[PDB]
Write a protein that binds this ligand. Structure first.
Ligand code: NA
Length: 91
DNA sequence: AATAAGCGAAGTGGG
DNA sequence: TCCCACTTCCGCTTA
C-alpha cells in the first residue's frame, strides 16, 4: 500500500482536498494542515489503508513524527506545518 | 476550565 | 525470525 508521505504529496499535487492541506512554500516542500478540516483528510487516509479503526489527525501525526529520524517529513516550528525532504520531492 | 497542538509501548500488516 | 510501516493506546506538556 501507499506510504503516508506519498499519500500527502499526491493530495498536494492533485489539489483534491485543498481546504484540508496546502503548500506553504512548495519550492521548500513546506505544507500545512487546516485546523478545522484536517480530520476529513485523516479519515480518508484510514479508509485508503483499510485500517480497522477510524483514523484521526492525532494518529496520523503520530505516524508523521516517525519520519523525523529518517527525514522524509520533518515538523516545522509553525502551527500544523511540516516539510518534505528534497529526496521525497524529487521522486 | 475548555480547547488544541505537540510529544513519544504494544499491536497489526506484509513481507 | 524479525523487520516494515505504521496503528492504537495511553499519559504528559505547552499555549
Ligand atoms: Na490538534
Amino acid at each position: 500500500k501507499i506510504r503516508l508521505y506519498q499519500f500527502l504529496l499526491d493530495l498536494l499535487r492533485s489539489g483534491d482536498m485543498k481546504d484540508s492541506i496546502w503548500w506553504v512554500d512548495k519550492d521548500k516542500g513546506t505544507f500545512q494542515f487546516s485546523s478545522k478540516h484536517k480530520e476529513a483528510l485523516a479519515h480518508r487516509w484510514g479508509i485508503q489503508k483499510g485500517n480497522r479503526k477510524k483514523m484521526t489527525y492525532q494518529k496520523m501525526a503520530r505516524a508523521l513524527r516517525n519520519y523525523g529520524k529518517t527525514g522524509e517529513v520533518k515538523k516545522v516550528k509553525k502551527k500544523l506545518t511540516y516539510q518534505f525532504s528534497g529526496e521525497v520531492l524529487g521522486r
